[PDB]
Amino acid sequence: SNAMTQLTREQVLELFHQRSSTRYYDPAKKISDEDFECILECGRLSPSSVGSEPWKFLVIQNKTLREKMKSFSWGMMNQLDNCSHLVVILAKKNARYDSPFFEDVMVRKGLNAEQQQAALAKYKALQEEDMKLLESDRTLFDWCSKQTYIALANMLTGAAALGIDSCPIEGFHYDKMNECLAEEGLFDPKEYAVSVAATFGYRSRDIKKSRKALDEVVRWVE
Amino acid sequence: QLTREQVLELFHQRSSTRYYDPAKKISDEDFECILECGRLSPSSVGSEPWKFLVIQNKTLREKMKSFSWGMMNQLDNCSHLVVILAKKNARYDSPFFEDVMVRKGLNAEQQQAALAKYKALQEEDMKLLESDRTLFDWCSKQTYIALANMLTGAAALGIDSCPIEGFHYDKMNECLAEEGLFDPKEYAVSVAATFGYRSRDIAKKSRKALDEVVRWVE
Ligand SMILES: Cc1cc2nc3c(=O)[nH]c(=O)nc-3n(C[C@H](O)[C@H](O)[C@H](O)COP(=O)(O)O)c2cc1C
Ligand SMILES: Cc1cc2nc3c(=O)[nH]c(=O)nc-3n(C[C@H](O)[C@H](O)[C@H](O)COP(=O)(O)O)c2cc1C
Ligand SMILES: O=[N+]([O-])c1ccc(O)cc1
Ligand SMILES: O=[N+]([O-])c1ccc(O)cc1
Numbered sequence: 001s002n003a004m005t006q007l008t009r010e011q012v013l014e015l016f017h018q019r020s021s022t023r024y025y026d027p028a029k030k031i032s033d034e035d036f037e038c039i040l041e042c043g044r045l046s047p048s049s050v051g052s053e054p055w056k057f058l059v060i061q062n063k064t065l066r067e068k069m070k071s072f073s074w075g076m077m078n079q080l081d082n083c084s085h086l087v088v089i090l091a092k093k094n095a096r097y098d099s100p101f102f103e104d105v106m107v108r109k110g111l112n113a114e115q116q117q118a119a120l121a122k123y124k125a126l127q128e129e130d131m132k133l134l135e136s137d138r139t140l141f142d143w144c145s146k147q148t149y150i151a152l153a154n155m156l157t158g159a160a161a162l163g164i165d166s167c168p169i170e171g172f173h174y175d176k177m178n179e180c181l182a183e184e185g186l187f188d189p190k191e192y193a194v195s196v197a198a199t200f201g202y203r204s205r206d207i208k209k210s211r212k213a214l215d216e217v218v219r220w221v222e
Numbered sequence: 223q224l225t226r227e228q229v230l231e232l233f234h235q236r237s238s239t240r241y242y243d244p245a246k247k248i249s250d251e252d253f254e255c256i257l258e259c260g261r262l263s264p265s266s267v268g269s270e271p272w273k274f275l276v277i278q279n280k281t282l283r284e285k286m287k288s289f290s291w292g293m294m295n296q297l298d299n300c301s302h303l304v305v306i307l308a309k310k311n312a313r314y315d316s317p318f319f320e321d322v323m324v325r326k327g328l329n330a331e332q333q334q335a336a337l338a339k340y341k342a343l344q345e346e347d348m349k350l351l352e353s354d355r356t357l358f359d360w361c362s363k364q365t366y367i368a369l370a371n372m373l374t375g376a377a378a379l380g381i382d383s384c385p386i387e388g389f390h391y392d393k394m395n396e397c398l399a400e401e402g403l404f405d406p407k408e409y410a411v412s413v414a415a416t417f418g419y420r421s422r423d424i425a426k427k428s429r430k431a432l433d434e435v436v437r438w439v440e
Contacts, residue, residue: 005231009255011403012375016262020371025309038226044432045233046370048388053430061440074339074347108428122291122388130250130291130390138352142359146413148405150385153263161224163234168367170266186439187422196363210326211261212270219403220259220276 001060019160019210024205027082031200036085038187039200041157043089043151052105052125054092055151055195056146058186068180075171076199088177089152090187091195092142094137097123129196136187141193145188148195160199169197236377237424238384239416242299246419252379256417259375260306260368266287267340269322271309271361272368272412275403276302285397292388293416301385301418305394306369307404308361308412311354314340328415358410365412382424386414 007015026171031039036059043057060066065082073080080086088105095101127133133140152168159166174194182189224350248256253276260274277283283297290297297303312318315335325331344350350357369385376383397420399406 001237005235006380007378009251009379012255012378013258013262015378016259016375019262019264021264034226038229040432040436041230042233044429044435046234047236047238047373047385051427053435055435057436059436059438061438065439075343077375108430110428124393125387131387132391135355137357142356142363146359146363149363149366150370153367154374155263155370155375158229158233160231162226168264168266170310170348173345173420174349184439186437209262210268211411214254214257214261214387217261217270217272218274218276220278221282221401221403222278 015161019157020165020207020209021201022165022166022201022207023079023166024083024203025079025082025165026204027198030163031084035164036200038088038162039159041106041165042154046151046154048147049143050105050126051109052095052102052144053090054095054101054186055148055194056148056157057151058088058090058181060088061085065184066222069172069177070174073169073172075176076167076169076197079167079169079199081097082201082204083199085199086199087155087182087194088197089148090192091141091148093141093144093191093193095140095144096134097127107215152196152198155198160165164200165203166200169199172197196220197212223369226343229265232374232378234426236373237426239382239384239385239418239420240296241295241419241421241424242340242382242416242419243303244299246301248301248381248417248419252381253417255379256372256376256381257412259371260304263364263368263371265364265367267319267322268326269309269312269319269364271312271318271359272365273404273409275307275398276369277303277305282401286394289435290389290392291384291386293386293414296386298386299418300416303414303416304363305398306412306415307409308358308365310358310361310408310410314344314359360410365390368381369413369415374416382420382432383420384416386416389414412432
């Protein structure tokens with residue numbers, strides 16, 4: 001890393017202040033294919049526990065599907081008509097250490113058989129004892145869903161770095177959204193479920209930050 | 223504003239560092255900038271349901287080793303360690319949520335309408351109220367946004383990091399509560415992260431191809 005591959009502290013703070021939730025999009029302004037691919041890359045390159053990458057990104061451009069969405073998506077009703085791109089992020093269901101899904105996770109690490117068994121033993125303990133994820137199907141799904149929020153965050157920040165506005169979205173009926181997207185054939189509902197969404201585009205109305213102070217959220221243990 | 227190549231370089235510079243140089247410390251100003259990236263993160267309903275515990279005490283780090291397999295050696299060598307807490311019991315009808323509404327400036331009528339909207343969000347749209355753990359996990363998801371932004375902001379400053387789940391969560395929560403750092407009825411440990419400077423080159427790890435993870439619905 002050097003001064004040319006870094007941002008200054010001033011530039012980092014500007015980036016994270018600029019990143020904001022846009023609720024009014026200009027329908028006449030579309031993100032270029034290349035800029036949007038870059039945004040998706042920010043999601044794809046995100047870290048994830050155990051390298052599990054337990055996400056799928058559905059890019060919902062079809063206008064008829066966006067319209068149907070409106071009736072059960074109160075949190076983005078006024079964005080569905082005018083945003084450039086909409087991403088619905090799915091998270092993997094039943095991502096147990098002993099599942100076929102986890103074999104592919106391991107294969108792309110390029111480990112030998114002994115390293116693979118050492119890794120698997122770590123991941124079993126992580127799920128079973130340390131994080132207690134096998135309490136229920138939902139607990140294990142929510143673990144994958146947490147990893148998807150990393151990908152979400154990175155797509156919002158990457159978009160902001162490109163000068164592109166965005167809004168993270170939880171304001172929809174999850175059962176209705178899962179049912180609709182599965183009925184459209186967009187994923188196997190036994191294997192994935194909706195985690196979170198995000199809109200992207202260019203704002204048509206102005207957005208300053210309101211946050212708790214650093215001293216109210218940070219505690220130093222020296 | 224950055225070029226596409228610069229944005230890509232940032233996310234490629236960001237890697238999970240397991241081997242830290244124990245002689246390299248992050249400056250106070252750089253670390254405050256990292257914390258700002260967490261503080262400035264978005265969160266559902268603007269709930270900001272997090273606390274960032276900066277664990278620099280060496281005796282406390284040494285105690286954690288016995289139940290933190292995923293960062294055992296990082297604890298000896300990293301510059302800074304953050305344990306992020308998430309709010310427990312963040313119900314729409316809790317005082318925690320009332321404070322959110324008030325500081326947004328909502329009047330009495332608007333607060334009543336907002337309570338109804340977020341009741342519906344939690345009870346029906348997201349079904350967060352199935353159990354205490356489902357509601358906690360909602361706040362925990364928001365903290366993963368703050369985590370991600372800290373890792374990326376650190377990388378932008380030239381500072382290495384590693385997100386951490388590899389510890390016994392209940393033992394960590396018991397320890398940190400015994401230290402008096404939070405009220406365990408109000409918060410619980412969500413995720414951690416180390417920060418510092420790598421002691422060797424970190425081979426870039428693989429990812430599934432874009433075509434594997436993206437589906438276009440046109
Ligand atoms: C939430 C989360 C928890 C993780 N926990 C650990 C951990 O405890 N110890 C560890 O060495 N790596 C941990 N990792 C790092 C992942 O193994 C790593 O992100 C993945 O292998 C991809 O490598 P990269 O981030 O270098 O691209 C974790 C990652 C995330 C996102
Ligand atoms: C996971 C998540 C879901 C959210 N859901 C919605 C939503 O459905 N609709 C909306 O208008 N804003 C939504 N927001 C945006 C938040 O209200 C916003 O992040 C917060 O008020 C802080 O504002 P800022 O992002 O402009 O800094 C969501 C944020 C997060 C992180
Ligand atoms: O050792 N561990 O508990 C780990 C190691 C890697 C990881 O991504 C998560 C947990
Ligand atoms: O309309 N909604 O459901 C919302 C709106 C804003 C938000 O942060 C979360 C949910």
